[model samples]
Target: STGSATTTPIDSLDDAYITPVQIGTPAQTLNLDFDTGSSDLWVFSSETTASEVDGQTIYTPSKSTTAKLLSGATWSISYGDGSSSSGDVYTDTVSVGGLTVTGQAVESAKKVSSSFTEDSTIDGLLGLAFSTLNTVSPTQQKTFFDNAKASLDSPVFTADLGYHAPGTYNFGFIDTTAYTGSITYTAVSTKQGFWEWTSTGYAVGSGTFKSTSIDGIADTGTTLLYLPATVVSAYWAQVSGAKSSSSVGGYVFPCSATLPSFTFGVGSARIVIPGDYIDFGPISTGSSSCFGGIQSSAGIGINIFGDVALKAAFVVFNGATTPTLGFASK
Candidate 1:
């Protein structure tokens, strides 16, 4: 059948959301970030450098009787900043939300920089994006969801993220009770190896909607919403005393400035993010200037529909042969 899991926000700002996942035999539980933007189920493990184990729960392959190293199989992922994590691969039983998958590829990190070691909120990441993005060498491995989808009642999963509240993630079957109204469906483009889709249009606050076709990926792994520079300026210009700060590298406004809500269209549906969510707290602790949750995605090349956008609505990642995305208001 189906499975469900509770996803908890690690901070008041919803910095990250994590779900408890069971890996290996005897089932070692690890709280992992279920990211929809990448494909590599990696973790802090016995193979990790001892100095990098800063308050993280490490997975020991030897502890699981069923754990089997996949000889010659390896994975590596690096970022633009040069921070990276690389590891060997193992096939073992992996489970999430009570759903189990045998022979699931688990990448055990042998090396990681402070980018991962500094964050204790997440022990690892469980990639839910398309398997095409998997980084395993020789033979690219499938994601946990990819391996489990065939047996699921429906080739679907959902993300119900809340602001400052614990949310829920469901697999196989949709939980109608978790959302309101009818879901608006949109086609997905897997060529980019992400849950990529286009928004029908957008409205600045209560302004008339502009049919600006915005293409972006649903990245739960990311913390902010990034849009085109023109659209971004259109938003920040609404608030008094708002400016694009060079030091901050984004738009910031007076904490006392009145802000407007952000609405994005999916098909005929419009999802609105509250003004309160836009004020991403002060730029510095106790500072009067606050960072805007929405920023320009210009230099980055790709626009990102991250948590700031996703948390405003219930999102569905339907992994049919030709996958699609579904958006529902809650």
Candidate 2:
């Protein structure tokens, strides 16, 4: 059966979006971040230390009759932003939107990093990546999407990420009305458990598009767009006061600088990101310094098309035999 869910933005448009999810028998509802960059459905639960949970809600397995321990199974996950969580395993009824899965593996966190413990609004994360990337020990767990795909009419999901408003994530089918223009489809290589693709090239503003082949992943969990160091330097050079700030970290520029639009090629499709989106707001609200939304992916091998870039396009994550990515102007 097809299902659709609303994704609400947290702090402005820079933070992650949260979606409501139900876990256990009696339906303990929690707001979780639907992350496409990782694979593992983990939650802040009764297993977590009270001090570690902060103001976020926790899931209690004992409260649900359907909850069952998975013997000696455990899980641990770390994010690029240094956020992490570790927990034991449990088989419980998990539901997203209106679709329910009976024996879904739900990792209950016993420990969490400062990054996670502080984010009181985000109760957990729902990984949408391939199940092969699941971190559960003994036996890897399947993602909610993986388990539900077999019963779906089509193994596809659409991400309609908004700028400053609420968006929708549609499962089992694509909503045509959510996007405009023809959808441009491209083959995706999921060898790394990500929606990885090779971009044909890119251009700064109205400049001629260059033919720089760059490989990267479309990560919904990431906040900014990350590209090669050379590419990032090139883009920064165009800005009058832009510079690589060791103090601020990443590239920073004067808030008043007029930024140029960025365009990237996805096969034959051209996805353009507006200039204002690149200016990820002032560095500290009222400060004259501003951090760039596009940074260098030098240390990290692959570039990341994060929310900053993904929000500009309507994306489809197709989980069929040959997983593909479909993009269209929103």
Candidate 3:
């Protein structure tokens, strides 16, 4: 059977895309950030330190008869900014968009970073990345997508992001109405357990396309597009007053500046992101300098194609024996 779910940002910042999920037997639903960049289905739970929990909902295993402890199974994850969440594991009835995974490994957080505690809009994270990246020790666990793939019409899923609006994630079969044209397929390299793809080229605004090979990961967990320093600098230079300012959140520029559009290649398909989308938002309350949605990956070690870039087109992840990615201009 095929399945589908809605992805809506909790706020105007578009920092995360949330999807409500059902966990346990009685079906306690929680709003979870569906992340494609990471691979751990962790949540705030009874296991989480009380003080460490804030406004988020806690998942109680004892309350769900279907919940079973995965003996000695543990997981830990650290973020790029040193923030993190780590805990024990449990297998339970987890459901999303009408699709169910009865024995899904659900990580119960015993500790969480301030960043996770402070984000009240989401109770946890439901990662859709490759199962190879799962953090469970001794015996690695499979991701929700991996476990549910066998029941799906096809082992494929598609992501269509709407700017400041709710998008949809479809599993099994692609929804024909989601895009206007045919999708262009490209080979994917999951060497490091990521949907890494190489772009054929890129263009600054309506400028001529510069042919070059650029590698990056399509990550929905991250909020911005991070590319090479040379590419990032070229885009920022077009703005009258734009500069790299870590003090104000990476790249920052005047809110009144007329920003240019960004275009990237996906095989023969060119997805264009509007200039307005690049104006992430004000650096602070009523600030005139806005934070740029695109930045350099020089410090991150690996380039990332985050929400800013993914929202520009319809993306498909074909999780067949040999993986492939499909891009379509929607």
Candidate 4:
């Protein structure tokens, strides 16, 4: 199971199979999507009717003694893919494996639409990232990492993508077996509300830069990694030779060949994104080749690395400890 690490087949939502992760003490097993694009942990509750929660995994609050409801409060989130969900807030004792983190703010979605509810196996979402993009209000904003940061044996977080199935993402402490020697680290810039950073530059194949002095943001919520125009065009210049025309706005290269690899330097830590992650989704001409890890998002406000960069590295948003993000190899 290359990407199916610890992944057990559950129900389907939006035509996609769902995955479950055991959370809390005595282990409250929840079927959820490990989402990096957004920083929020939510689930469908017993309060939600079957019609509203169709294709969603619902968890009974009575099942967990640690669960607490935040009745009346509401939250709504919309994704770039045109998916959205709305719900009320609740406070519960959440456990991941043997680790028990109390006062975990969990959102109980009363109304779920988008790709989430359509998937039956996916009961909820465990967002393991920084605390910047919290869906809760400025007053109530609290992330799962924020609650666990104080107690973890180490102030480190790791992602084991190799263990899980394709697109499967894991969080918590880093496994030494995964990375030998001392791993590199970086200080997250907390200028705006969300965790944002500037890219030193980018490269297509070799260390040589197709585009240099580029600025981008690392967004786990985004499925596709997008870059600036200058950087995207430059990298595509090198990769397009082996790929076909991008009928869509983004370039799609030939999947047959080993697509050129690229890297993004964030401070001292340099992250390398694989070639296969370059493909967008199913297409008529064929799977459209990703122009590069970076695409044109000039008008889109900030550039998001998306899952393209996240799958390659483990990220820790240590906001509870400090306004910083830590990165390590899986």
Please give the lDDT score for candidate 1: 0.90
Off by over 4 Å in 1: 79-83
lDDT of 1 by residue, 1-330 (tens): 677999999887888899999998899999999999889999999999999889888889999988999999999996323467998999989888988999999999999878889888888989998999899999999999999998899989999998989888899998899889999999999998999999988888889998879999999988889999999999998999999999998999999987899999998889998888787889889999998999999998898999999999899999999899999999
Clash count, one per candidate? 0, 0, 0, 30
Task: Give me candidate 2's TM-score against the actual structure.
Answer: 0.97
- The deviation in Å at residue 197 for candidate 2 is 0.8
Q: What is the per-residue lDDT of model 2 for residues 163-206, given as tens digits with 9 covering 90 to 100? A: 87788888899888988888998889999989888888889888
Cα RMSD, model 2: 1.2
* Pairs clashing within candidate 3: none
What lDDT does each candidate get? 0.90, 0.90, 0.90, 0.59
Local lDDT at 315 for model 4: 61
* Residue lDDT tens for model 3, 36-146: 877889999998999999899889999999999999999999855557989999999998899888999999999999898888888998888898888999899999999
Alpha-carbon RMSD, each predicted model: 1.2, 1.2, 1.0, 5.0
Worst 10 residues of 1 by lDDT: 78-87
Ranking by TM-score: 3, 1, 2, 4
Candidate 4: TM-score?
Answer: 0.77
